[PDB]
PDB file of N, CA and C and ligand atoms in Angstrom:
ATOM      1  N   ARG P   1       3.451  17.382  -1.014  1.00 33.51           N
ATOM      2  CA  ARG P   1       2.545  17.306  -2.230  1.00 33.51           C
ATOM      3  C   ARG P   1       1.127  17.367  -1.881  1.00 33.51           C
ATOM      4  N   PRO P   2       0.232  17.833  -2.787  1.00 35.91           N
ATOM      5  CA  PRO P   2      -1.218  17.879  -2.455  1.00 35.91           C
ATOM      6  C   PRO P   2      -1.756  16.486  -2.160  1.00 35.91           C
ATOM      7  N   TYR P   3      -0.921  15.524  -2.037  1.00 35.00           N
ATOM      8  CA  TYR P   3      -1.384  14.162  -1.797  1.00 35.00           C
ATOM      9  C   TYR P   3      -0.535  13.354  -0.841  1.00 35.00           C
ATOM     10  N   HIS P   4      -0.767  13.542   0.464  1.00 38.20           N
ATOM     11  CA  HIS P   4      -0.036  12.924   1.511  1.00 38.20           C
ATOM     12  C   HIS P   4      -0.962  12.055   2.330  1.00 38.20           C
ATOM     13  N   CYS P   5      -0.531  10.828   2.575  1.00 37.04           N
ATOM     14  CA  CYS P   5      -1.407   9.885   3.425  1.00 37.04           C
ATOM     15  C   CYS P   5      -1.984  10.608   4.642  1.00 37.04           C
ATOM     16  N   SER P   6      -2.978  10.044   5.209  1.00 35.31           N
ATOM     17  CA  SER P   6      -3.574  10.553   6.382  1.00 35.31           C
ATOM     18  C   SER P   6      -2.922   9.915   7.700  1.00 35.31           C
ATOM     19  N   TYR P   7      -1.743   9.412   7.403  1.00 36.65           N
ATOM     20  CA  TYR P   7      -0.955   8.702   8.578  1.00 36.65           C
ATOM     21  C   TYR P   7       0.490   8.693   8.113  1.00 36.65           C
ATOM     22  N   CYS P   8       0.822   7.716   7.272  1.00 40.33           N
ATOM     23  CA  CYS P   8       2.291   7.710   6.801  1.00 40.33           C
ATOM     24  C   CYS P   8       2.689   9.006   6.159  1.00 40.33           C
ATOM     25  N   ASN P   9       3.715   8.855   5.352  1.00 38.83           N
ATOM     26  CA  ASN P   9       4.228  10.053   4.722  1.00 38.83           C
ATOM     27  C   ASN P   9       4.268   9.618   3.206  1.00 38.83           C
ATOM     28  N   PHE P  10       3.439   8.694   2.752  1.00 34.75           N
ATOM     29  CA  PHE P  10       3.518   8.233   1.395  1.00 34.75           C
ATOM     30  C   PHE P  10       2.876   9.321   0.564  1.00 34.75           C
ATOM     31  N   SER P  11       3.757  10.077  -0.041  1.00 32.76           N
ATOM     32  CA  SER P  11       3.266  11.138  -0.927  1.00 32.76           C
ATOM     33  C   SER P  11       2.932  10.634  -2.299  1.00 32.76           C
ATOM     34  N   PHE P  12       1.796  10.652  -2.732  1.00 39.14           N
ATOM     35  CA  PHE P  12       1.388  10.192  -4.162  1.00 39.14           C
ATOM     36  C   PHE P  12       1.380  11.372  -5.059  1.00 39.14           C
ATOM     37  N   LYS P  13       0.825  11.077  -6.207  1.00 40.71           N
ATOM     38  CA  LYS P  13       0.757  12.142  -7.350  1.00 40.71           C
ATOM     39  C   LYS P  13      -0.681  12.597  -7.611  1.00 40.71           C
ATOM     40  N   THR P  14      -1.595  11.677  -7.561  1.00 39.27           N
ATOM     41  CA  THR P  14      -3.004  12.082  -7.742  1.00 39.27           C
ATOM     42  C   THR P  14      -3.966  11.506  -6.780  1.00 39.27           C
ATOM     43  N   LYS P  15      -5.191  11.864  -6.872  1.00 41.25           N
ATOM     44  CA  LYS P  15      -6.244  11.198  -5.981  1.00 41.25           C
ATOM     45  C   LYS P  15      -6.440   9.765  -6.156  1.00 41.25           C
ATOM     46  N   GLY P  16      -6.324   9.363  -7.446  1.00 40.96           N
ATOM     47  CA  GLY P  16      -6.505   7.953  -7.829  1.00 40.96           C
ATOM     48  C   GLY P  16      -5.488   7.160  -6.950  1.00 40.96           C
ATOM     49  N   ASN P  17      -4.239   7.524  -7.055  1.00 42.75           N
ATOM     50  CA  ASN P  17      -3.245   6.676  -6.355  1.00 42.75           C
ATOM     51  C   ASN P  17      -3.445   6.854  -4.812  1.00 42.75           C
ATOM     52  N   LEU P  18      -3.445   8.067  -4.368  1.00 43.28           N
ATOM     53  CA  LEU P  18      -3.679   8.332  -2.862  1.00 43.28           C
ATOM     54  C   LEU P  18      -4.797   7.387  -2.470  1.00 43.28           C
ATOM     55  N   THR P  19      -5.843   7.399  -3.202  1.00 43.84           N
ATOM     56  CA  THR P  19      -7.137   6.568  -2.839  1.00 43.84           C
ATOM     57  C   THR P  19      -6.716   5.139  -2.761  1.00 43.84           C
ATOM     58  N   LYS P  20      -5.883   4.656  -3.674  1.00 43.66           N
ATOM     59  CA  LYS P  20      -5.446   3.230  -3.640  1.00 43.66           C
ATOM     60  C   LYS P  20      -4.885   2.873  -2.218  1.00 43.66           C
ATOM     61  N   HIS P  21      -4.196   3.836  -1.612  1.00 41.96           N
ATOM     62  CA  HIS P  21      -3.653   3.650  -0.311  1.00 41.96           C
ATOM     63  C   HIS P  21      -4.763   3.538   0.759  1.00 41.96           C
ATOM     64  N   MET P  22      -5.661   4.476   0.703  1.00 42.88           N
ATOM     65  CA  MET P  22      -6.770   4.534   1.654  1.00 42.88           C
ATOM     66  C   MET P  22      -7.767   3.356   1.309  1.00 42.88           C
ATOM     67  N   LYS P  23      -7.644   2.928   0.108  1.00 43.42           N
ATOM     68  CA  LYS P  23      -8.497   1.755  -0.364  1.00 43.42           C
ATOM     69  C   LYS P  23      -8.136   0.513   0.370  1.00 43.42           C
ATOM     70  N   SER P  24      -6.954   0.034   0.168  1.00 42.68           N
ATOM     71  CA  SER P  24      -6.440  -1.200   0.845  1.00 42.68           C
ATOM     72  C   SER P  24      -6.737  -1.114   2.393  1.00 42.68           C
ATOM     73  N   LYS P  25      -6.481  -2.049   3.070  1.00 43.85           N
ATOM     74  CA  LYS P  25      -6.763  -2.029   4.566  1.00 43.85           C
ATOM     75  C   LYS P  25      -5.551  -1.240   5.293  1.00 43.85           C
ATOM     76  N   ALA P  26      -5.006  -0.291   4.545  1.00 45.69           N
ATOM     77  CA  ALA P  26      -3.895   0.407   5.081  1.00 45.69           C
ATOM     78  C   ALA P  26      -4.337   0.955   6.492  1.00 45.69           C
ATOM     79  N   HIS P  27      -4.945   2.099   6.532  1.00 47.73           N
ATOM     80  CA  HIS P  27      -5.390   2.669   7.890  1.00 47.73           C
ATOM     81  C   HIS P  27      -6.083   3.929   7.700  1.00 47.73           C
ATOM     82  N   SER P  28      -7.258   3.895   7.253  1.00 48.32           N
ATOM     83  CA  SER P  28      -8.012   5.260   7.080  1.00 48.32           C
ATOM     84  C   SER P  28      -9.491   4.907   6.894  1.00 48.32           C
ATOM     85  N   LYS P  29     -10.132   4.144   7.722  1.00 45.20           N
ATOM     86  CA  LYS P  29     -11.499   3.784   7.459  1.00 45.20           C
ATOM     87  C   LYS P  29     -12.348   4.847   8.272  1.00 45.20           C
ATOM     88  N   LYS P  30     -11.929   6.082   8.273  1.00 47.85           N
ATOM     89  CA  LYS P  30     -12.606   7.195   8.964  1.00 47.85           C
ATOM     90  C   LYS P  30     -12.214   8.573   8.418  1.00 47.85           C
TER      91      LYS P  30
HETATM   92 ZN1   ZN M   1      -0.735   5.593   5.222  1.00 48.32          ZN
END
């Protein structure tokens, strides 16, 4: 999908959600 984590394979539906992943201390402060 046009929304795949920059690490995991957590495929979201929109930027808002995907951002929620990068938002938390997941792993993408870069
Ligand atoms: Zn991830």
